[PDB]
Design an enzyme around this catalytic site. Structure first.
Site: not given
Ligand SMILES: [Mg+2]
Ligand SMILES: [Mg+2]
Ligand SMILES: [Mg+2]
Ligand SMILES: [Mg+2]
Ligand SMILES: [Mg+2]
Ligand SMILES: [Mg+2]
Lengths: 310, 310, 310, 310, 310, 310
Positions: D106-108, D187, D220-222, D224, D226
């Site tokens: 992710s560039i952002r 987030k 998205h499972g990582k 944290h 959103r």
């Molecule tokens: Mg996540």
């Protein structure tokens, strides 16, 4: 401010005409030394005509006063003309002049009407009788109820068969804008004064719960809903009560429309039903701060949320 | 500057009409080579019409001259028209034309009247006869006294039943603004030419002692008070005396209104009473610099101070 | 605001060092949900370090709060450093840390010192011990009296052998500027703490009567004069009394310097002498509103006026 | 975009160092004619050094391409350096270089880390090992979980003992900002990776229901949460599924943290639990669009509303 | 302009160092009255050092001269330094100084090199020996051929294995920009001086026919292609011929690289082959205006067009 | 967009008049909650009159929608008036109203006509019957063919006896500008509908080959040429085919003018001749991508090139 802040009365053929003040006449008044005997009398500047009574000095913004109005804007003249146009549609008799000019009115309401009247898209621009009805309601010289067609205006943010909801633009106002920039208030007016079907109420409440969840739905009893921040419901309760109290002392009739119990905030319906029963402020205001157990339509939030997911 | 700086005379049916100069005709005049025989005669530009006499070159600002007027502004035309409008309300006969056009007038006074005449709030905008009276007083072709209604104008900073006090706006002027930015002068005009009760004088003196303590209250004898910095009273004494002296040499009548002795600065009343007795400049001016022992109302400062504390 | 609004304490070798807050740590604190158990404890942001106790939220300007400080300006850091530089010149012991950080200080005073410290012309820029003395006086951790050399600063508008008078620049301030634009306050500091000859007092009083006639000369008892608008003397009496009262309840010694009776406003000397005798607020404040009959030097106004005429 | 868009590998002493591209080398590449045999090879400009493989042309904004990155900004260099700083903290062996450079990132996310690293208030500015951990997580070359201290950053809008919530600033970004201005995403990161007490979860859910009622809480499972608009949950389901599917085809392990069932949107927990059971996209996505009957804490909305009324 | 317009020679240890002119010394020279005996000698200003010979006055822009250079820009100093840096890399002996300083050079070429040298992405910024080779080629004190690595620079608009094509930026130049805004010129440099395969030539010609169809492909014989508007080929023929003629009169060797006959415009190859055979201008220039019947690769236009359709 | 997006029908004396929408009525519609039963019916705002059917919401740009029109510009009103002026020149009967208002039209075409109508140099400004013919062609309520005199307009970039070529200005448009800035399209209209001599065709083709070599010459069959980028011919083939297909399903007659085979791009003539024979899209579109062997005038490029050399 009182109507006497924008116009003074002039007699012609035993019928009263009203005339807007020059802002330079107001500015001369604010520098005048006046006897206390004369503070309730209209002031005469030599150069710019008649000026409001010096007892109204605090209604006008000065280097010292920020809680008044910006009387040197063009908007002051437009609002004064609007008032004067409506006062002249009546023919106020001498017995009445002092009473009409004593009436306190919302400057922001009057300014918003000017914004409607000068907009060629707005029906008020085209109907001199609608504009007059709108202004007469505003300056409390009519017992008709403000509806969508006669509303003060603003930005339309929601509409259905029964209701139009307006965002009040008071921060952008020229004559007496709201100063805290944290201000947001909305208005829900009736399109017609008929009974409203349950689907059209469900549509309104769904929009308020989804898009205005941080706002209370209250009313000041004059026939329309006001969407205000919860952090300001306490102040609104004060002003509504003072008005209800002051009208009991003066004998003015207090007819308070409680509106639909399914739309009004539950606590506010309580505080105002109690007020309508005659209880004191403290009995009434404490009902604002209770948490009540129960409501009218369930699952409205979920329906709108599921619509968005698609 | 002289009236001949703004208009030239033109005869029609043995009655004189006056015509404003074009500023390009003035600009052509300032480049003209003219015989000394012709310096008192009106100049003819071929392209832009008639121009003032070349002897008036110094009245006009140039790359070299800053002590004249900005004749290329629109304001020059408005002031020329105002003069011309008033000169045409008279019908000046041939015997008189040279004398009227020779009269020296205050450009700043004329400019201020233009600012009043073009302001729709000002009574001068609505009364062509008031404006004419005002201009005729200004250009010294009337013996009426300047009062509030006929005043040159400015910002009203104080008003009561008897007096209006004006701040002179000369720094903002277009045609001949005052250059030092340290300038402040005020004017107190009479509302009516009647006698004034003691309370209305007390009100004025209280305001001057409280808000204009660093200013002398003087007069040039023409019926109104001038509020000037103490650092400039010496220069004012010079000009008032020169005028009083020059009128004794020319035979013009010198009626000098000393105004209320309770309002005028004590030393200035002395210098001007002495002048009115016939003494020379040095006898008179030395009374400006004395410190005199005594005054009219005591405790006015304290009353206003105590009002502010509340 | 309290000292704990700009720094937090950190222990090193049983001697306390103080550390300025990051403004982003403050901003994280203002969004934090904190137990009431923890509102008096320093807050920990994960990203930006330690933040003030959440009980101080109201000291910081928010979208909702305008009565706090602009903690996101560079000036906040400079003032925090200045405080921290002075707190570190002491070596505050654990018993004392809570008391020093509880001390309420004038942010505007601290900001003005920063403006002096960063100015290469100012002696404070060159003397780290003068700056430290100046800051220690400001944060009430020194019993020396503020004098010209240790003054908070501002524009010098008058100076003589005994006094320097400063215009307080609070409208231009970055961290906590005064909002009403009608504000003007001046300060007269002592050059030395010696007795002052009568001529040097006459010089001061002459300047105040001539140039500051619309101002009261008062004091808060800490050794210097304050030149404040008469319309604000009532508010000053309140704050001075609250401080005198709060220190009687807390046992802090109340030594109040009444200063020269020839310079202080007569009514204010009365209200504060009465306060120093132990009377209540109402006995004391009513002396502000009396008009008293008598004063120290006569004719000072006239001398200065006559100087200007020359 | 792939890591090979910002750096190219260079060997020194059998340990790989990575070098940022010059943006002029990229610009030369975008004008190059290249054999298809060479589109996966690094390009050589003669003037500006090595450039990314021409197969990556679409990652870079052109007069024709708006769906790439603004590689000519200074931010491109800072992000390339950040990547390169982290790739050099590893010593990537020849077997691995192609795989690391193939990783899509992710560039952002990388840009936001640069904004943290260059901010002196941010702990990342002071801890080269925290910054390295943060970047390694971002470029997927670490299996640690992103937490508050290692988060990509943004504006903190809520914090408590267990959680920090960040507003994602992607509209202001220099390298690859989000184009629709209707974008808002938040987030929620874990402060620690410990278990979380029920009160700290109640605090989070109360804030989300009150202030983010128009937002779904997904993951998205990582590790944290959103906070995304309900109108975009469908797109998020697509991307999460594609990633879960693509990793099943490639053999990469798919460990998906479902997070707290009391915080996640109910429907989203369903769609992702179904995905974790192995169902196809259509079985899974249809659970997003159901309306489910039941939830974890009741009356949280009412408590916060009643707090505001006070 | 001649090299003597930017530097003057100074002897140290029988080795010549060159020194840039101050622009104020040039400005003093342009006001100087000088004997014709001294117009070829370096001028001495008293205040600003040595100035170019007054015979070079026309090389410098004046209120009267627009066909010279903007010697008062910072760029003039950078170009003078660049020249001086290269002249000092040689050690010019006394016999040679007059000849080197007499050499006429392209200011726009030198300015473009400065733009390369000061750009950290450009190899010239990093290789003092490449920059020196580049400058020595430019000022004609080297017989190496300009290639891509030693090119004057500009915007790269096309690159392949054999060629780099540059857009000449002369309109943006500070020292001597091209004035007609209708100017466009491109340059094709060789990457290496090797033979070029047929595919790499086909790639170039395809790009020129498709994107530069309104441009002629010509050369001045010094090893690279110039892409110029057809409306200017006539002027280029003049200048190329004058140079070829002037070098035949002076004995300077004329080696003219005709480049690839498949790339050069057919008519231009004719005019220059004829010139290389010894014919006069009129024999040669008339071949520019013929329409010749035949060419090297057919269907290149169609291939590129069909690529675009996909 | 459909004609019903700019006007609504109103009956007077059994003849239909059409009335432009107010943009505030559109804005109220976009906030309205409407039954699906009513999405094809005209909407009534109370304040601003009638609004388009809510099924057209997507035609209007919103905070969410960028693929619609900027209905709040003055241009929207001018285009609505233009449509309404033309619809009122017909007298549409009740049977027809729904069909006319259903017609989809080019907003950019209509905007360009407004730009012609309001330009005093343009014949459309002076001929109400030409403007009406032009608008009727545009809104598909006339079977006349667009020619130069009735063209939508733009910048004239080429003209001869038979043709006028226009650059389409769609990037500058107010109501619905093209967003990609890489857009360029030209239009070639017939001056008269007569046969065209071979020299006038040669002149056109020469200009297109020389100045528009990177453009395909195509047509949509309605009588004029369109000069479009080769990279967009594929999209044009789609839209032309969809229209040809949709008209076969609806029974609308499909007369397609293939124009001059010497001017149209060869491949496009193939794809459209095949379409006119009845083949499917895939048979037709594949002819766009072939490279065909042969064309009409040879050496036109060379003639123009040789003209430029002189
Ligand atoms: Mg996540
Ligand atoms: Mg109400
Ligand atoms: Mg006078
Ligand atoms: Mg004090
Ligand atoms: Mg060459
Ligand atoms: Mg067509």
């Amino acid at each position: 401010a009182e109507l006497a802040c924008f116009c003074y009365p002039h007699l012609e053929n035993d019928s009263y005409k009203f005339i807007p003040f020059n802002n330079l006449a107001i500015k001369a008044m604010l520098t005048a030394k006046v006897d206390k005997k004369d503070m309730d009398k209209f002031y005469d500047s030599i150069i710019y005509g008649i000026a409001p009574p010096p007892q109204f000095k605090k209604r006008y913004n000065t280097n010292d006063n920020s809680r008044g109005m910006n009387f040197e804007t063009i908007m002051f003249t437009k609002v004064a003309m609007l008032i004067c146009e409506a006062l002249n549609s009546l023919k106020v008799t001498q017995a009445n002049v002092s009473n009409v000019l004593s009436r306190v009115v919302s400057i922001r309401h009057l300014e918003n009407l000017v914004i409607r009247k000068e907009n060629p898209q707005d029906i008020l621009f085209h109907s001199k009788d609608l504009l007059l009805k709108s202004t007469l309601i505003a300056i409390g010289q009519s017992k008709e109820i403000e509806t969508t067609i006669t509303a003060e205006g603003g930005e339309i943010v929601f509409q259905n068969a029964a209701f139009t909801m307006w965002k009040l633009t008071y921060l952008e106002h020229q004559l007496m804008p709201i100063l805290d920039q944290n201000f947001i208030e909305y208005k829900v007016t009736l399109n017609e004064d008929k009974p409203i079907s349950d689907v059209h109420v469900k549509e309104l409440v769904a929009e308020l719960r989804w898009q205005y969840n941080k706002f209370a739905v209250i009313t000041h009893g004059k026939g329309h809903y006001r969407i205000v921040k919860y952090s300001s419901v306490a102040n609104h309760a004060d002003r509504v009560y003072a008005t209800f109290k002051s009208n009991v002392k003066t004998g003015v009739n207090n007819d308070f429309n409680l509106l639909d119990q399914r739309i009004i905030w539950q606590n506010w319906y309580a505080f105002t039903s109690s007020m309508k029963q005659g209880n004191t402020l403290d009995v009434c205001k404490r009902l604002l701060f209770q948490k009540m157990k129960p409501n009218p339509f369930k699952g409205l939030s979920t329906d709108r949320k599921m619509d968005e997911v698609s």
